[model samples]
Target: LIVTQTMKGLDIQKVAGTWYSLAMAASDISLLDAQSAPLRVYVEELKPTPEGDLEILLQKWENGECAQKKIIAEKTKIPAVFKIDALNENKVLVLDTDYKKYLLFCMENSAEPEQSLACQCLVRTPEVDDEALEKFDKALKALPMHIRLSFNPTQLEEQCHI
Candidate 1:
């Protein structure tokens, strides 16, 4: 079973504002390996539109420079679920969030061949508290597959600008 539930009663507005990347985990190693992958993303902001969709502003580091990228995640029937037009129409689920401290989410790629899973942890600050870290550990362990790549924040500070 994958992450089966989102934080109950998630308020999109409260989840908005500045966030820093803490870590990322993916079923495919190449999907998150900063050294080998050509593209790496750091989420900057989540803005909820009046229509209930979300606008994500990201900092993309590729080809030796950091650039801004934006994606719109449209609302679905389930409040916690959304469909991204970009990235092969991946479905995004809000696994957990406190709004003030941390946000945890998973992305499911529904393309052919196989389904890919990627999860990320975001914090209001650079450092994470024990509670957030503990939650992340639990979430990752619940993945259906054992194979996963754990990404660190070392390279994050080494090459990206807010």
Candidate 2:
């Protein structure tokens, strides 16, 4: 089930930069080369959809491939900046976007092509209420399957650190 937490102030603009992927789980947790997942972050151009909610696009470099661009997800407009909701000493934060939240964990080592680190991205839904949490939970649970089958790690890794 999705668990909704209190909205914390987050700097969505600050988050608009490159990021690395440390870990992922498909059938199991996979170690990703930290140097490989350099994500060039930016906010999508906002436009009003027929549904009337503002849509923001999140894009990332897939499998370290410069030519390959992946649309991570879309989010609805909320009044707060997405912040590091929860974290440890590593400077990781649970990022809350309009569409989903993800765990952005920091790497102990800087960009190293040969070395691997662990990070993850999980789906999140807005915490409208207790019921919204359930939906969020369900969505997060489905991430493993999507990562395992759809994600191309080798390509992502190659494009990152040189």
Candidate 3:
């Protein structure tokens, strides 16, 4: 059975901050395929709005230039779940996080089933310690998707504007 759950009692405020992509996985390879992998984007900041929505600041490299983009995810009845309509309508779930070390995310397409599943691992720092690495790997292992991409070390470095 394919199963995943949002973090219980997730505090949106505590996990709102800059995040770097550590790894990603999906049920279908084409979901992340292109000239540059689309889902590899870094989260510059996760801001919690007064309306309880989550504002995600994203950073991506295109044509050797870095660009910043923003997307607002509407809060749902579940504390850690949000609905986003960017590129496509999807449910964003905060699968797991420690607020300081790492964040795990799951995005499922609202309509489509074949290309619906994708997961991400994010960390506060580009360079991760043994503990964080272990935690990330453990989380990845529990997901139903078996295909994962451990990106190059320089990936996070190039995403950093500062």
Candidate 4:
């Protein structure tokens, strides 16, 4: 039997920030709207798994409404060595500081009529080539049908920073 454990120093405070969204095959990062849903790019919390992986608590809002909060179960196992890879102005590929698989998040400045924002999961492989890219696309194809939306961040101005 293989028993796994969580990692230490898995706190959200250290991973919170304004992250740029990059295009998968483009050259620009998405300009996030502070007033709409997906109010801010923030990591709410982080948890460790017995398999030595990390679970990320991620959240976003759309059109002033809260969207489905995600538990990135076993998203990454490495800590403190995460790097932000910009695929374009509106897309970004996140890599663990150890160069391990992290996440590939697609962002945009516009809003989908009935939705606020959009996101999908990406898996990493040992191959250094475009393996991650292929995984991202494959994961996207199997994503559940959910309405993406945006939220307003101005509501937290007095309580949070811009």
Strongest candidate by TM-score: 1
Relative to the unseen true structure, what is the C-alpha lDDT of residue 4 in candidate 2, on a scale of 0 to 100? Answer: 26
For candidate 1, the lDDT comes to 0.72
Clashing pairs in 1: none
After superposition, the stretches of candidate 1 with alpha carbons farther than 4 Å from their true spots are 35-39, 112-115, 144-162
Deviating ranges (above 4 Å) for candidate 2: 1-7, 26-67, 79-157, 160-162
List the candidates' TM-scores in order: 0.84, 0.29, 0.82, 0.29
Against the true structure, candidate 2 reaches a TM-score of 0.29
Candidate 3 global TM-score? 0.82
lDDT of model 2 at position 36: 33
RMSD of each: 2.9, 15.0, 2.9, 13.7
lDDT of 3 by residue, 1-162 (tens): 133566899888888877877777777666566425555456778999988999999875555666787989999998988989874547888878889988888777767733667777788887744676576567667655646765555667665332
RMSD of 3: 2.9
lDDT of 4 at 117: 26
lDDT of 1 by residue, 62-159 (tens): 55677677999998888888888665437888989989999998777666213467777888876646688678879888675334433345544543
Would you list the C-alpha lDDT of every candidate in the order shown?
0.72, 0.30, 0.72, 0.33
Q: Which stretch of 10 consecutive residues in model 3 shows the poorest summed lDDT? A: 33-42
lDDT (Cα, 0-100) at 91 in candidate 1 = 82
